[PDB]
């Protein structure tokens, strides 16, 4: 039950993707050390709505309260924007945006280090962006998903950083979450053999120590169970017919949006 889209759906979802990506490079500025996350999830949704004439995928989803998803240093994800927290030097975070437009959903996320990199931070998020990367690279026509995991798990863990297992990565078109699921590590389950026009999502969690994680009492909010740092990077793709294109591809992204295996 993977959805093949058609290039009508796929060209809808290069604009649901792009606005979701600038979203991402809008709220940049506003990332700074005293600013609320609350006062950042505002930004976001009356960009979204009354600029991009786009609706948040994630507002009301399941009964989530807020139109982004904003995760500091130890929070893996799901994090609420909320005023009492305030972004502080040497944080890390993780701004995660879904939108509707015109039925189609562009789901993607990145990380953003506040006033001074620590050096702990900066290595976690460098090689969590580059395990999304080397996954990207993977992605074409008859290759399997089980493949592109082990290939994420194997290098976040040659790091001494671990793989959440709890979230993957989607299928994603006019439903937020269709099949597949992406795993990002290695599982005897996986056997989708990827073709031209699937589109899915990848986003990899990685923790700087164990890969466990418990839920607070609010309901939403992802921790790590060792109060280590995790970071995630997620970008929306479709396959082609050599390769795949990022339909959620930032100025500040350094791979290319059109990633092509052919001679
Ligand atoms: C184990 O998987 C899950 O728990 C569910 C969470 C429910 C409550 C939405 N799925 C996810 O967390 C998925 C994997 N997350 C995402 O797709 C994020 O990329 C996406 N932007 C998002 C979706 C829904 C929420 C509440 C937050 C973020
Ligand atoms: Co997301
Ligand atoms: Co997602
Ligand atoms: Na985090």
Redesign the pocket.
């Known amino acids: 039950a993977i959805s093949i889209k058609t290039p009508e759906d796929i060209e809808k979802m290069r604009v649901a993707g792009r606005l979701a990506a600038e979203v991402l490079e809008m709220i940049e500025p506003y990332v700074k050390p005293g600013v609320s996350t609350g006062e950042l999830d505002r930004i976001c949704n009356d960009y979204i709505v009354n600029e991009q004439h786009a609706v948040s ?2 507002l009301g ?2 009964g ?1 309260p807020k139109s982004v ?1 904003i995760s500091i240093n130890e929070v893996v ?2 994090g609420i924007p909320d005023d009492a927290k305030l972004l502080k030097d040497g944080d890390i975070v993780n701004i ?3 939108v509707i437009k015109d039925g189609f959903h562009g ?1 993607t ?1 990145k990380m953003f280090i506040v006033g001074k990199p620590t050096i702990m931070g900066e290595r976690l998020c460098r090689i969590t962006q580059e395990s999304l990367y080397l996954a990207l690279r993977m992605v074409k026509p008859g290759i399997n998903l089980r493949e592109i995991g082990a290939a994420i798990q194997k290098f976040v863990e040659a790091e001494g950083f671990s793989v959440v297992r ?5 299928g994603i078109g006019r439903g ?2 269709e099949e597949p699921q992406v795993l990002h590590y290695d599982s005897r389950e996986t056997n989708v053999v990827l073709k031209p026009g699937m589109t899915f ?1 990848i ?1 990899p969690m990685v923790n700087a120590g164990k890969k466990e994680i418990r839920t607070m009492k609010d309901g ?1 909010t992802v921790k790590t169970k060792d109060r280590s740092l995790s970071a995630q990077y ?1 970008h929306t793709i479709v396959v082609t017919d050599n390769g795949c294109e990022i339909l959620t591809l930032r100025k500040d992204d350094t791979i290319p949006a059109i990633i092509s295996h052919d001679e």
Request: charged fraction near 20%; glycine fraction near 4%; aromatic fraction near 20%.
């Open positions: 995928a994630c989803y399941h989530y998803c994800c799901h995660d945006v879904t789901d996320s709890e979230y993957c990565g989607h937020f979450h999502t986003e939403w997620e």
